[PDB]
């Protein structure tokens, strides 16, 4: 009764300030928490005083929240956006001309966490109970495939109440819950026929052997190493899987004297380096082997960040980066030149491993793709290991070539 | 519940026999091949008569079969005793009832241009005998809209 | 073991202690105690599956040593000696993985057999190249020595890793993840099967089936990834797994989530051909899947008695009364045959089919009393049917006895049905009114329904429709709970309960099922609502004091009347008139009813008489007219009289009087000028009489009628009327009477209605009626600037290009034509009105001009089109000579091509692009290529003029170029040259995605282009290197588009017209039953022509073509895709070498050999099997393929479109949708009429039929074809008008093209020739549609059409370039 008079004059002010400042802020999280608290306070009870001043704020606020939740953001940020944009303290009577801007976040809330799917089903029941079926159907017509697919997926939710309310709203929809979906449901399919990487296993009891594919195994390892909910020993097992996959997918046919005689040649430090340009614009689609290699490499780089896995992951990662960069400089420099790196050559698919001829052996340039996808990872702590990888690459390149400025002409750096 | 037909009874016996187990004790060596009563239930209720295959009946009628299998054997009563006359008579009775139901089902130029339908229109103020062309009707609609606007 | 884990699951300490205790009991003192281990099996299993790794390890170490370390022994153990019942809803197959991977050898170096993906060592460069280079290299500071030493030490550390470290961690990883571990078993078990010898494999396969059953191993029935699912998937994924029983397959499919996998396996067994059990189980499983078409096809293949086929055909297309009559005739004939002699027991399934389908038909025909009398037969009481049909006739005692008889023997799948029946009983029983357990029953029913839902496939389909329908009746029972709670005398009359009752009644009135649902569900809903409506009515008859206004009883009366009327309307829509008359006789038996709903009842009656007046008889139609005239109009309103007179005029125009009908139409329109339907029908009649008598004073009237009908209504409805309006413009005279007529009464019609017909009115823009149509298009454009700017832009540029060729003699600029100035003044006005939006559109169009890529793919596409035309012309010379000479036109084409070879508004982008082209044209590579080509492509030498010599040289150059063009960029950044596109933002202009204004949408949520994605990929599609552009919107989604360079301004404009036609026909498919029921719809991508040479088309990334899949399979096999055509032509030449012109047998054997040698019919089938490993995904893809193929075949046959070449059919892998590459009407260039009379009506080559497994054809394909034929055949849609409107401009362009060769006066074709030709053309399509729609006697010509589409006697005569084998 008394405090609503001092908050009303500043409502528009704080709303607009938080909306325009979080866009160019350093940690735009506390502002959205403040907005959520303000919405909760305005919705709590029937104030009927701040409602009049909040009504003219929906035209821009709803659009901004929709643009925010539609863009790519971290999981917690997206959850906060979708939950604060759905729980607006405004009655449906006035949200009619601004209702269309609530289906895009609704379909995401239905696909979100348990709290998010519950809030989405709550809003869906609220709008289907407080509005005529015809207008609501004409309203959801633009986005019906996603909404119905999410309502059908959440029906299998372990939570009994969630599935029950989902079934209740589906029955409330009536015949519209099964209308033809022009945007037909998507289904998984394979794009290539070549087999992915596998590990050889033998059986001495029957004098035979098998091949164990490990694409989905590496995928599971990376997935459980990325998430934070996994336990430490499972992370260690996944790191072990990735390490054995990495070490099993290389030749390991190098000698000490032979390596010394190969790297100790005057041409490596005297001959001009071919200035060919590497560009993924000519690179074909990623083969199963290459994507599995990238996944294993990024999983190793992540384990190098994991605290309990760092002591054994960081040295192995450094040594593997050394191996990759050394084989690269050996195949692309020295007296032995590949038919695609000689003088006068041009960019081509021979530099990358592809389903076509491509290169003769596995492309060592995949290490750069791993560092790229790691630095572009959602978590920024991974950028440290990427910088360490680049540092060791440059250092060992200058060591093997000397005259640091000369080691930068390698197409590897391009 | 309706009586069990010898056809579906032999079907049940065979389904149990096709479970690779003996009736002497229904857990034979390779104990993982426990009796799948739901499987034989599904295989039996696909016979002539109604489902009649709840959790109870499946066990009850097999326990009834065991004594008379350890008189004529079920396989003998199937191959013998008018092999296909029982189910065929059942189906003939069903079809006769069908025809009786379908038969007893029910089967399911006075020009009068009365003056009421024309008198209501005359009261409305429009002539029916003289068809007003659509152009004049459109002009009248435009004039009415103009009058309304003023 | 029993209680410690049940009551203390969270306290892992005591659980671990008990597990250590049992592990010690099992480990130590084994020689003393071995009987105690029998009862503690559940404890051991639980400790093995515990979440703690140490306990799991110490349990597995003792579980493994108890068995021999042999793969076969462990497999036999886990398959027949181990009982997993004690596990409990666990994915025990991971323990099988543990056991199978632990026995592997783990004392050897690690390695891999993937030699193709091997990574080269550091010293691998010492042996790759020649010898002496490395021999001389081998005979040639500390900072490098230390690095080498450390690297060698590290490599030595890696070489110590053994295989045992990999498998243990692999198993520990599979432990935590149920997904991607099921896959490991699926992918590893067949690998084990491969190494097992025949002796082991035989016994294992013989004992697996007992293990597939394994009795009490059913707790997994509710497990999402049930173990039996994975096990049977793995078993089926083996090579030799022949022995598996079909009964067990069906049982696993039903109980476990193995529906589609089980169906695929059963049909794979069935199509390999004592053996009828396979087909019986397959038909049962199909009937369980609600897939009516596959079941019908399978039975038609199995049908012995001819009557069964006709009955199934009738019931499949909604002919329920004729289906019931045919079933009755069939079972009567069977009874007669039985009286003659006994039949084989294999006929019993047909008898059960007849029984259950007659029951279903009688259920659909509103025979509830007959069904009750039948199920209640003394000798064979059918308690389920009685329980189903008892509550709908208020037989509550029979319903209660049937329920108590079913509750003890109800299928667990019908648990929610039993709960709903128990609720109905408790709510509606007279002497058992106990409203204490209501919400509990609803909760239990919902839980059971959700549990059953969890047992269905993950991809929603017809299998899930029953539960989606049950949800509505369940929530209605929940609402009925409070309804009855409020109707009791304690709450009777209370306002709080009255408001709730009113709200619930309004919601019920506004909540309706869809027409796609069978009438059975509509009845189950409406009759259930009727009980409570009557209760409300009756409840307000003994409480005259409560609410003394005679309103709440009237509320229930009105609700019941409206529900009855809606049920009758739905029954009528589905094609039932007898049940409609029955319902009308029913509603007539009421003391009194409202006057508002009686008018609607009379309206439905006259609508029934209307739709029944197709072949109306004199007696029946006159009796209907008398019944109509007998209705009283005293206490009624005025608008109702208008509608009544309109319907009277309609019904009387149906008969050949035409005078009283005109009078009634005029009187109705005068009664209520706002009535849209009356004026629309009046305009229809006026158009008819105008086309017949040809009186000028009637065309203006018809156009005014159509316009006034289109004024105040929605665009979806008014579309077919604007279609009629646009066609009438071809009858105007020199005075342009109807032109001024339409120009005088156009003020008032919404402008959005013309968006779907902009192209139709643009063609008239160039006629003598220009100025008024220009004003009209400009007026409608003032609201939609882009929708009118893009088409006028394209047409203006095409006119300028055409004039450039018309004035070849005059150099420099030239004067503009009349249509040019006309359509450019409007563009000037638009720029004056919408400057920012049009400027942004111009910027976009000028930036996308940079997509003129290069000469490489340009000349590639040129020579591809050349080869295509060469083959098309050689097929004509095939049978005659086949040693033919190149035609003059093809010679000129190839000459111009090899001469230009790629290099052939006051803007500056075009100038910069030309400068860049001239710059890049200074390299020696392309010059040498041009020289080498010109030194070969010359025709002035003898022996080179032969057509096949040219074809061979073209193929050689095609191979050379495709080997050359394989080194080019695959994507480029948009910011490289397209600055305005990269800098584009929502703040610049509110421009919408192209192709949005084409079809108006009810809502205004049009996704605006937020920004253009930086990457622009290059994809090889349509035999050209198209540029794929990605555009992002404010919603976060991305839309891909192909900036296609047409290079032919006529063919593209004629191609994108059938797309508009199909888009216009798409709504109609969604307004009828048997079409929505089958999900029939045209997949029409969006195509907008931005210039004569360039057009922007929508697409999706994963969309292959038939030729793409064929050439992919060939490259996999390592052969050339041009081999079969060359072989056909070689056989043709070698046969004609002895003067014998190739006969029919020659073509037949050529087809047979090319199919058996290099093109097996099982190519597409194996491709689909490999592409979609999941059974559900494969089944969904195949069903979508079948339905879309049927739809497009019906389209290409009924609509005289060009032959569906294999490269045209696009096949979307992500959804299975089938869209073709821009069909076009094959109008004869000589005669100007449609002559789509090829030997094959539609593409059903052997490969397709093999992919459709020969039953998808006989079922869903022909079923969908018949449905879509009967759908468009309905007169209410007036598809003939749309066809006429499109063919008008399709023939105007033909005339323009035919008259351009000779040489405003010639701007108009004729006043009588164009109309006559259009009428001749449209009838050719209408007759072909009616021939397919005919469904007399349960038989249709579609069967003979599909049979001829795959007959070898006709396929061999098709063009080799058409690929009758692919
Ligand atoms: O729904 P009904 O009352 O039975 O009649 C409808 C109605 O037209 P009317 O209500 O004016 O008769 C439809 O349109 P809506 O009113 O539902 O939007 C539609 O007619 P349109 O074709 O004009 O959309 C349809 O017709 P169809 O069967 O062609 O879809 C059908 O009319 P019928 O009486 O022919 O069923």
One DSSP character per residue, A67-96 reads HHHHS---HHHHHHHHHHHHS-S--TTT-G
Are C323 and C314 in contact by the 8 Å Cβ rule? The answer is: yes
Q: Give the separation between CA C997 and CA C746, rounded to whole angstroms.
A: 21
Distances (CA, A) of C895 to B118, C890, C923, C938, C958: 80, 8, 23, 8, 17
Q: Which of C80, C324, C581 sits opposite B30 (nearest CB)?
A: C80
Q: Chain C interface, mutation test: which of A248, A334, A337, most C Cβ atoms within 10 Å?
A: A248
Assign C1015 to helix, strand or coil.
Answer: strand
DSSP C218: T
Which of ligand 1's atoms lies nearest the C-alpha of C604?
4
Helix (H, G, I), strand (E, B) or coil at C1032: strand
Sorted by sequence, the CB contacts under 8 Å of residue A302 that are 6+ apart come out as A222, A225, A226, A374, A377, A382, A385
Interface with chain B: mutation pick from C215, C221, C251, C277, highest number of B CBs within 10 Å: C215
Task: Pick from C1276, C1279, C1281, C1282 the residue to mutate for probing ligand 1's pocket: most ligand atoms within 8 Å of its CB.
Answer: C1276
- Grouping H, G, I as helix, E, B as strand and the rest as coil, residue A208 is strand
Asked if B135 and C641 come within 8 Å (Cβ–Cβ), the reply is no
**SS3 (DSSP) at C1218:** strand
Is there a contact between C116 and A359 (Cβ–Cβ < 8 Å)? no
C-alpha C239/C-alpha C229 separation (Å) is 18
8 Å CB contact of B111 and C582: no
Q: Which residues of C touch B137 (CB under 8 A)?
A: 666, 669-670, 673
In this complex, the chains that touch C, judged by 3 or more CB pairs closer than 8 A, are: A, B
- Answer whether B16's CB lies under 8 Å from B40's CB: yes
Rounded to 10 deg, the angle between the C292-302 and C276-288 helix axes is: 160
Burial environment of residue C51 by CB neighbours within 10 A (0 to 12, 13 to 18, 19 or more) = exposed
User: In A, which residues are within 8 Å of C1172 by CB distance?
Assistant: 187-190
Residues of A in contact with C103 (CB under 8 A): 203, 205
Residue among A168, A197, A240 minimizing CB distance to C117: A197
Mention every residue, 6+ apart, whose C-beta is less than 8 A from residue C1278: C720, C723, C724
Q: Which chains reach chain B with 3 or more Cβ–Cβ distances below 8 angstroms?
A: C
Contact B129 C248 (CB under 8 A): no
Q: Which bin fits C943, alpha (ψ -120 to 50), beta or left (φ > 0)?
A: left
Which residue of B101, B124, B133, B148 is the best one to mutate when testing the C interface, meaning the one whose CB has the most C CBs within 10 A? Answer: B101
Distance from CA of C258 to the nearest CA of B (A): 15
Tokens 């009477």, located at residue: C737
Intra-chain end-to-end CA distance of chain A, in Å: 68
The shortest C-alpha distance from C778 to chain A (Å) reads: 29
**How far does B98 lie from chain C, in Å, by closest CA?**
7
d(CA C574, CA C975): 57
Q: Which two tokens stand for residue B135?
A: 């152009």
CA of C1063 relative to ligand 1 center, distance in Å: 20
d(CA A225, CA A239) in angstroms, rounded, equals 8
In degrees, rounded to 5, the angle at the alpha carbon of residue C607 between the alpha carbons of residues C603 and C613 is 145
Tell me how close the Cα of B70 comes to any Cα of chain C, in angstroms. 23
**CB C603 less than 6 A from any atom of ligand 1:** no
C834: left (phi over 0), alpha (psi -120 to 50) or beta: beta
Q: CA C55, C223, A181: angle at the middle one, nearest 5?
A: 140
DSSP code, position B132? P
In this structure, the strands spanning C1218-1219 and C1103-1105 are: unpaired
Which residue in A100, A211, A230 is closest to C191 by CB distance?
A211
Residue C1001 corresponds to which tokens in the numbers above? 């949408």
Taking the CB of residue B84, how many other CB atoms lie within 10 A of it?
16
The residues that bridge with A210 in the sheet, in sequence order, are A201
Question: Which token pair is C405?
Answer: 């008889």
The answer for residues whose C-beta is within 8 angstroms of residue C694's C-beta and 6 or more apart is C731
C1071 lines ligand 1 (CB under 6 A): yes
Q: C1196 is written with which tokens? A: 């290409």
Is the CB of residue C789 below 6 angstroms from any atom belonging to ligand 1?
Answer: no
C chain contacts of residue A67, beta-carbon cutoff 8 Å: 1034
| Experiment type | cryo-EM
Dist. CA A78–CA B18, nearest whole Å: 57
C167 and A216: CB-CB below 8 Å? Answer: no
Q: Which two tokens stand for residue C1034?
A: 């404010």
What's the rounded Cα separation, in Å, for the pair C1042 and C1222?
Answer: 14
The DSSP line for C119-178 is PP-GGGGGTSS-HHHHHHHTT--HHHHHHHHHHHHHHHHHTT-BTHHHHHHHHHHHHH-S
Q: Ligand 1 pocket test: pick from C522, C566, C573, C675 the residue with the most ligand atoms within 8 Å of its Cβ.
A: C573
Cα–Cα distance between B114 and C288 in angstroms, integer?
Answer: 58
Sequence-distant (≥ 6) Cβ neighbours of residue C447 within 8 angstroms: A160, A164
CA-CA distance, A358 to A344, in Å (whole number)? 18
- Length of chain B, in residues: 150
- B43:C210 CB<8 A: no
Give every CB contact of residue C1180 below 8 A, 6+ residues apart in sequence: A185, A187, C459, C461, C1216
In Å, how far from its chain's centre is CA A2? 49
| Owner of token pair 């007849």 | C354
Cα(C416)–Cα(C449) distance, integer angstroms = 6
How close B65 comes to chain C (CA, Å)? 19
How deeply is C1282 buried, as exposed, middle or buried, from its count of CB atoms within 10 A (0-12, 13-18, 19+)? Answer: buried
Separation between Cα atoms, residue A223 and residue C465, nearest integer Å:
36
Phi, psi of C246 (to 5 degrees): -70, -30
Cα separation, C388 vs C371, whole angstroms: 9
Contact yes or no for C532/C480 (Cβ under 8 A): yes
Residue C932 in tokens? 């080498």
| Resolution expressed in Å | 9.4
Interface contact A25, partner C, CB < 8 A: no
Tell me the C-alpha distance between C643 and C1115, whole Å: 68
Closest residue in C to B42 (Cα–Cα): C251
Q: Does A273 touch chain C (CB under 8 A)?
A: no
- How many angstroms separate the CA of residue B138 from the nearest CA in chain C? 8
């Amino acid at each position: 009764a008394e405090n609503e008079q001092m908050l009303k004059p500043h409502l528009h002010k704080i709303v607009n300030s938080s909306m325009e400042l979080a866009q160019t802020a350093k940690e735009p999280y506390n502002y959205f928490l403040l907005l959520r608290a303000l919405f909760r306070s305005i919705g709590g009870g029937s104030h009927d005083l701040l409602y009049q001043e909040f009504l003219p704020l929906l035209p821009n606020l709803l659009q901004g929240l929709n643009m925010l939740q539609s863009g790519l953001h971290k999981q917690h940020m997206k959850d906060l956006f979708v939950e604060l944009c759905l729980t607006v303290p405004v009655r449906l009577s006035s949200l009619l001309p601004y209702l269309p801007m609530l289906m895009d976040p609704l379909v995401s809330a239905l696909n979100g966490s348990q709290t998010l799917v519950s809030q989405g089903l709550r809003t869906l029941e609220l709008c289907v109970d407080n509005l005529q079926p015809d207008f609501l159907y004409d309203h959801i017509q633009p986005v019906r495939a996603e909404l119905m697919q999410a309502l059908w997926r959440t029906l299998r939710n372990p939570a009994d109440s969630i599935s029950h309310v989902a079934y209740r709203v589906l029955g409330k929809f009536g015949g519209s819950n099964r209308k033809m979906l022009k945007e037909s449901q998507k289904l998984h399919y394979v794009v290539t026929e070549v087999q992915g990487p596998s590990i050889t296993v033998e059986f001495s009891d029957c004098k035979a052997s098998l091949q164990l594919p490990m694409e989905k195994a590496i995928e599971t390892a990376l997935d459980c190493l990325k998430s934070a909910n996994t336990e430490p020993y499972y992370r260690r097992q996944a790191w072990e899987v990735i390490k054995c996959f990495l070490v099993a997918m290389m030749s390991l046919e190098d000698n000490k004297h032979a390596l010394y005689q190969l790297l100790a040649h005057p041409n490596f430090t005297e001959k001009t380096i071919p200035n060919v340009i590497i560009s993924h614009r000519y690179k074909a689609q990623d083969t199963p082997a290459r994507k599995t290699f990238e996944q294993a490499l990024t999983g190793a780089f992540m384990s190098a960040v994991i605290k309990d896995l760092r002591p054994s992951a960081l040295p192995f990662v450094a040594s593997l980066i050394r191996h990759y960069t050394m084989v690269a400089v050996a195949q692309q420099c020295g007296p032995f030149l590949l038919p695609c790196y000689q003088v006068g050559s041009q960019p081509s698919t021979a530099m990358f491993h592809s389903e076509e001829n491509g290169s003769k052996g596995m492309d060592p340039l995949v290490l750069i793709d791993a560092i790229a996808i790691c630095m572009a990872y959602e978590e920024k702590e991974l950028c440290k290991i990427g910088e360490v990888a680049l540092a060791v690459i440059f250092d060992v390149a200058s060591i093997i070539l000397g005259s640091k400025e000369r080691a930068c002409q390698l197409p590897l750096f391009s | 519940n309706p009586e069990w037909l010898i056809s579906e009874d032999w079907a049940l016996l065979q389904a149990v026999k096709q479970l690779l187990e003996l009736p002497l004790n229904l857990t034979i060596v390779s104990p993982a091949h426990t009796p799948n009563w739901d499987l034989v239930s599904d295989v039996v209720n696909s016979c002539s008569r109604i489902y009649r295959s709840s959790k109870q009946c499946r066990n009850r009628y097999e326990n009834v079969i065991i004594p008379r299998e350890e008189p004529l054997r079920t396989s003998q009563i199937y191959a013998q005793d008018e092999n296909a006359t029982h189910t065929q008579l059942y189906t003939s009775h069903f079809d006769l009832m069908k025809m009786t139901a379908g038969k007893r089902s029910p089967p399911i130029n006075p020009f009068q241009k009365n003056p009421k339908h024309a008198s209501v229109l005359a009261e409305s103020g429009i002539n029916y005998d003289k068809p007003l062309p659509p152009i004049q009707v459109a002009s009248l609609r435009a004039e009415r809209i103009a009058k309304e606007k003023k | 073991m029993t209680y410690i884990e049940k009551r203390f699951p969270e306290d892992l300490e005591l659980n671990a202690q008990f597990l250590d205790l049992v592990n010690y009991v099992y480990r130590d003192e084994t020689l003393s105690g071995s009987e105690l281990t029998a009862k503690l099996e559940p404890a051991f299993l639980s400790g093995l599956r515990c979440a703690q790794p140490l306990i799991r390890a110490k349990f597995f170490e003792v579980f493994d040593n108890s068995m021999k370390r042999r793969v076969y022994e462990r497999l036999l153990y886990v398959t027949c000696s181990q009982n997993w019942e004690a596990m409990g809803n666990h994915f025990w197959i991971k323990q099988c993985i543990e056991l199978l991977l632990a026995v592997c050898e783990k004392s050897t170096p690690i390695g891999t057999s993937c030699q193709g993906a091997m990574l080269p060592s550091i010293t691998n460069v010492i042996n790759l190249a020649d010898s002496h280079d490395r021999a001389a290299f081998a005979m040639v500071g500390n900072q490098l020595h230390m690095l080498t030493n450390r690297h060698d030490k590290f490599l030595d550390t890696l070489r110590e890793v053994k295989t045992g470290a990999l498998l243990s961690a692999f198993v520990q990883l599979c432990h935590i993840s149920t997904t991607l571990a099921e896959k490991t078993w699926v992918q590893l078990f067949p690998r084990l099967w491969k190494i097992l010898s025949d002796r082991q494999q035989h016994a294992l396969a013989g004992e697996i089936s007992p293990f597939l059953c394994s009795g009490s191993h059913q707790v997994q029935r509710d497990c999402q990834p049930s173990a039996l699912n994975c096990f049977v998937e793995a078993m089926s994924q083996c090579v030799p797994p022949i022995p598996i029983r079909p009964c067990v397959l069906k049982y696993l499919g039903k109980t476990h989530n193995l529906w589609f996998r089980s169906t695929l396996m059963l049909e794979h067994q069935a199509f390999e051909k004592p053996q009828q059990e396979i087909l019986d189980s397959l038909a049962e499983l199909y009937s369980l899947l609600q897939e009516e078409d596959m079941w019908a096809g399978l039975w038609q293949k199995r049908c012995k008695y001819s009557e069964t086929a006709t009955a199934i055909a009738y019931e499949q297309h909604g002919f329920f009364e004729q289906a019931q009559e045919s079933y009755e005739k069939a079972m009567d004939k069977a009874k007669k045959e039985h009286e003659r002699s006994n039949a084989s027991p294999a006929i019993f399934p047909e008898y059960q089919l007849w029984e259950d389908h007659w029951i279903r038909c009688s259920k659909e025909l509103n025979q509830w009393e007959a069904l009750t009398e039948y199920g209640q037969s003394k000798g064979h009481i059918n308690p389920y049917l009685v329980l189903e049909c008892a509550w709908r006739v208020s037989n509550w005692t029979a319903m209660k006895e049937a329920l108590v008889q079913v509750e003890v023997s109800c299928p667990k799948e019908m648990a929610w049905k039993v709960n709903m029946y128990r609720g109905y009983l408790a709510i509606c029983h007279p002497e058992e009114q106990q409203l204490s357990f209501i919400e509990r029953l609803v909760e239990m029913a919902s839980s059971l329904a959700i549990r059953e839902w969890r047992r269905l496939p993950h991809v929603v389909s017809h299998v899930h429709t029953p539960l989606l329908q049950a949800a509505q009746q369940i929530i209605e029972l929940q609402e009925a709970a409070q309804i009855n709670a409020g109707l009791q005398p304690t709450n009777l009359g209370r306002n709080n309960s009255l408001h709730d009752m009113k709200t619930v009644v309004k919601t019920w009135r506004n909540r309706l099922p869809i027409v796609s649902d069978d009438l059975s569900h509509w009845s189950s809903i409406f009759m259930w609502r009727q009980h409570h409506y009557q209760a409300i009515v009756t409840a307000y008859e003994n409480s005259s004091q409560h609410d003394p206004s005679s309103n709440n009883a009237m509320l229930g009366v009105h609700a019941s009347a409206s529900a009855i009327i809606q049920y009758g309307k739905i029954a009528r829509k589905q094609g039932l008139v007898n049940v409609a008359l029955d319902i009308l006789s029913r509603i007539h038996t009421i003391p009194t009813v409202p006057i508002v709903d009686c008018f609607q009842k009379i309206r439905q009656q006259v609508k029934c008489y209307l739709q029944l007046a197709g072949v109306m008889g004199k007696n029946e139609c006159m009796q209907g007219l008398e019944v109509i005239e007998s209705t009283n109009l005293k206490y009624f309103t005025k608008e109702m009289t208008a509608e009544f007179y309109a319907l009277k005029g309609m019904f009387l125009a149906q008969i050949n009087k035409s005078e009283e009908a005109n009078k009634a139409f005029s009187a109705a329109v005068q009664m209520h000028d706002v009535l849209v339907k009356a004026w629309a029908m009046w305009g229809d009649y006026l158009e008819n009489i105008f086309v017949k008598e040809r009186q000028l004073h009637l065309g203006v009237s018809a156009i005014t009628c159509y316009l006034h009908a289109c004024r105040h209504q929605n665009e979806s409805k008014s579309r077919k009327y604007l279609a009629k309006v646009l066609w009438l413009l071809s009858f105007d005279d020199d005075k342009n009477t109807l032109a001024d007529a339409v120009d005088k009464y156009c003020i008032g019609v919404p402008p959005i209605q013309w968006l779907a017909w902009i192209p139709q009115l643009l063609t008239c823009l160039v006629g003598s009626e220009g100025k008024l149509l220009l004003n009209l298009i400009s007026q409608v454009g003032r609201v939609y600037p882009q929708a009118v700017y893009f088409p006028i832009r394209t047409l203006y540029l095409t006119l300028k290009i055409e004039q450039r060729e018309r004035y070849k003699s005059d150099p420099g600029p030239i004067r503009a034509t009349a249509p040019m100035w006309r359509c450019s003044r409007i563009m000037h006005m638009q720029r004056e009105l919408h400057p920012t939006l049009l400027s942004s559109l111009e910027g976009i169009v000028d930036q996308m001009v940079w997509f003129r890529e290069n000469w490489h793919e340009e000349v590639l596409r040129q020579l591809q089109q050349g080869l295509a035309k060469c083959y098309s012309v050689a097929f004509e010379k095939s049978g005659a000579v086949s040693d033919a000479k190149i035609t003059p036109h093809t010679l000129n084409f190839v000459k111009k091509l090899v001469s230009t070879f790629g290099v052939g508004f006051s803007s500056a982008a075009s100038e910069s692009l030309a400068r860049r082209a001239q710059a890049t044209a200074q390299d020696p590579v392309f010059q040498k290529l041009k020289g080498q080509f010109t030194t070969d492509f010359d025709f002035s030498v003898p022996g080179s003029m032969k057509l096949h010599n040219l074809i061979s040289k073209l193929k050689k150059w095609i191979k050379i170029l495709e080997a050359k063009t394989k080194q080019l960029p695959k994507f480029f950044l948009i910011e490289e040259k397209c600055r305005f596109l990269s800098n584009f933002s929502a703040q610049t202009a509110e421009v919408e995605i192209p192709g949005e204004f084409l079809m108006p949408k009810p809502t205004h949520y049009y996704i605006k282009i937020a920004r253009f994605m930086p990457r622009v990929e290059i994809v090889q599609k349509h035999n050209t290197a198209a540029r794929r552009l990605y555009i992002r919107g404010h919603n976060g989604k991305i839309y891909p588009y192909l900036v296609m360079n047409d290079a032919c301004l006529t063919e593209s404009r004629r191609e994108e017209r059938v797309l508009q036609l199909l888009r216009l026909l798409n709504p109609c498919l969604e307004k009828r039953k048997e079409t929505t029921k089958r999900h029939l719809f045209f997949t029409v991508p969006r195509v907008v022509a931005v210039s004569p040479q360039m057009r922007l088309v929508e697409d999706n990334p994963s969309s292959l073509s038939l030729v793409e899949i064929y050439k992919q399979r060939c490259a996999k096999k390592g052969i050339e895709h041009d081999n079969p055509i060359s072989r056909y032509y070689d056989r043709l030449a070698t046969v004609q070498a002895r003067g014998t012109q190739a006969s029919h047998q020659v073509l037949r054997d050529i087809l047979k050999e090319v199919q058996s040698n290099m093109v097996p019919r099982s190519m597409l089938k194996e491709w689909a099997l490999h592409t979609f490993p999941n059974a559900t995904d494969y089944w969904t893809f195949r069903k979508m393929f079948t339905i879309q193929l049927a739809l497009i075949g019906f389209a290409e046959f009924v609509l005289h479109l060009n032959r569906l070449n294999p490269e045209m059919l696009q096949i979307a892998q992500d959804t299975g949708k089938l869209n073709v590459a821009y069909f076009r009407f094959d109008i004869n260039d000589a005669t100007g009429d449609l002559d789509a009379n090829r030997p094959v009506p539609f593409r059903l080559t052997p490969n397709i039929s093999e992919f459709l497994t020969t039953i998808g054809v006989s079922g869903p394909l022909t079923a969908s074809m018949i449905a879509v034929a009967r759908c468009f055949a309905q007169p209410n849609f007036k598809v003939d008008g749309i066809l006429k409107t499109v063919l008008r401009d399709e023939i105007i362009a033909w005339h323009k093209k035919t008259q351009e060769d000779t040489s405003g006066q010639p701007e108009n074709m004729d006043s009588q020739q164009l109309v006559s030709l259009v009428q001749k053309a449209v009838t050719a399509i209408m007759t072909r549609l009616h021939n397919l729609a005919q469904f007399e006697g349960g038989e249709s010509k579609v069967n003979t059409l599909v049979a001829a589409a795959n007959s070898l006697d006709n396929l061999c005569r098709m063009d080799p370039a058409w690929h009758p084998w692919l």
